[PDB]
Ligand binder design. Structure first.
Ligand SMILES: *[C@@H]1O[C@H](CO)[C@@H](O[C@@H]2O[C@H](CO)[C@@H](O)[C@H](O)[C@H]2NC(C)=O)[C@H](O)[C@H]1NC(C)=O
Ligand SMILES: *[C@@H]1O[C@H](CO)[C@@H](O[C@@H]2O[C@H](CO)[C@@H](O)[C@H](O)[C@H]2NC(C)=O)[C@H](O)[C@H]1NC(C)=O
Ligand SMILES: *[C@@H]1O[C@H](CO)[C@@H](O)[C@H](O)[C@H]1NC(C)=O
Ligand SMILES: [Fe+3]
Ligand SMILES: [Zn+2]
Ligand SMILES: [Zn+2]
Lengths: 6, 335
């Protein structure tokens, strides 16, 4: 449930 | 002021965007990408400014630092003297829709049936129903629940794309843009109307706007509301007049997102462009209607009355709400 997907 | 660069998802959106750009005297210009996640990347690169997003995509964008700017506001159920731009948004009702003639089907017998979804990662089409189904089955194996589906954006060779149909030529099967016949609220509801699926995950408005003459679209023009039922979570089936008591969730309205650094300007430009091209806008329907696209919900939902100002300069979490954020996070644990 953390970082940017890109 | 600077021009605002809109991002259009697929060629039908791009065609609309280009008519808007021409009508706005190039105050708005267009970038186009194949999918919503790609538009989101153009916006993170600064190669586009903004687009309007379902709440499942707002979560993707927001994790990457993009912020909500204005929200879609449709006609209110209850009276308000306030202008549309100031009237608080209400949230739409995610529902599960079946045919009345498919008598045995309820929420509790959906396993191994055929399903129609607006696209992977969208609220009513995916995050709400699959999150509920993963939780209730105690299994992340959501790709194997339905025997076949159309879930645009999923692997085209998988069962989750088996029912997708592509464009007029049968190209682009399952791509998550309006080229795919069953994409979006209207394409998932068409998937059910044509009995390609047993169940469509869409919102309540979808059923009303595509039945009883409200759409003249060839596939819809002759659909009767009474032929449809909603699946309630307690296992009962109801007429589509009962969505307020037979829905899967209430969803945050679709909203415009941008980089934080461009939000102020995007918001000012859009407030003006809807004064011109919005519902009763000075130049709609004469010249161009920003919130019309013959039912196809291109750039904005066709039922949008105006884009409304947000209360409390919300973050994307605040906008989506804490419960829905957690629901997505939990579902996303499966991937
Ligand atoms: C389900 O969606 C339909 C379509 O938006 C809603 O019906 C509309 O409600 C507005 C506001 O009451 C009316 O003035 C429109 O005429 C209705 N449209 C149509 C096509 O009938 C309906 O209220 C929604 N149901 C629930 C419980 O939210
Ligand atoms: C799926 O189940 C999870 C697990 O219970 C739900 O997440 C909980 O939601 C409540 C209220 O929003 C929180 O107070 C809990 O702390 C959450 N649990 C976890 C592990 O985060 C989630 O809402 C469900 N998904 C649905 C209903 O779509
Ligand atoms: C374009 O933007 C400029 C600068 O704000 C404004 O003066 C003009 O009225 C706008 N015209 C259209 C068609 O949007
Ligand atoms: Fe949505
Ligand atoms: Zn409810
Ligand atoms: Zn806040």
């Amino acid at each position: 449930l953390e970082a940017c997907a890109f | 002021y600077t021009r605002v660069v809109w991002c259009a998802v697929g060629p039908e959106e791009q065609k609309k965007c280009q008519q808007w750009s021409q009508q706005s005297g190039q105050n708005v210009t267009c970038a186009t990408a194949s999918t919503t996640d790609d538009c989101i990347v153009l916006v993170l690169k600064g190669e586009a400014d903004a687009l309007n997003l379902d709440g499942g995509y707002i979560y993707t964008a927001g994790k990457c630092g993009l912020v909500p700017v204005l929200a879609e506001n449709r006609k209110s159920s209850k009276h308000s003297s306030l202008d549309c731009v100031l009237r608080p948004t209400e949230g739409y009702l995610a529902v599960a829709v079946v045919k009345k003639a498919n008598e045995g089907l309820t929420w509790n017998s959906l396993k191994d049936k055929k399903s129609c979804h607006t696209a992977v990662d969208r609220t009513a089409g995916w995050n709400i129903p699959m999150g509920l189904i993963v939780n209730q089955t105690g299994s992340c194996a959501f790709d194997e629940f339905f025997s076949q589906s159309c879930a645009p954006g999923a692997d085209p060779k998988s069962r989750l794309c088996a029912l997708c149909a592509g464009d007029d030529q049968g190209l682009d099967k399952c791509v998550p843009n309006s080229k795919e016949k069953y994409y979006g609220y209207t394409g998932a509801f068409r998937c059910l109307a044509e009995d390609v699926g047993d169940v469509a995950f869409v919102k309540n408005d979808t059923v009303w706007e595509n039945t009883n003459g409200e759409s003249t679209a060839d596939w819809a023009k002759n659909l009767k509301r009474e032929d449809f039922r909603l699946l309630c979570l307690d296992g009962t089936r109801k007429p589509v007049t009962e969505a307020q008591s037979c829905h899967l969730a209430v969803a945050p309205n679709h909203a415009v997102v941008s980089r934080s650094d461009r939000a102020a300007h995007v918001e000012q430009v859009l407030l003006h462009q809807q004064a011109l091209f919005g519902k009763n806008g000075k130049n709609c329907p004469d010249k161009f209607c920003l919130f019309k696209s013959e039912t196809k919900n291109l750039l904005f939902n066709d039922n949008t009355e105006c884009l409304a100002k947000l209360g409390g300069r919300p973050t994307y979490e605040e906008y989506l709400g804490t419960e829905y954020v957690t629901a997505i996070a939990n579902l996303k644990k499966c991937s």
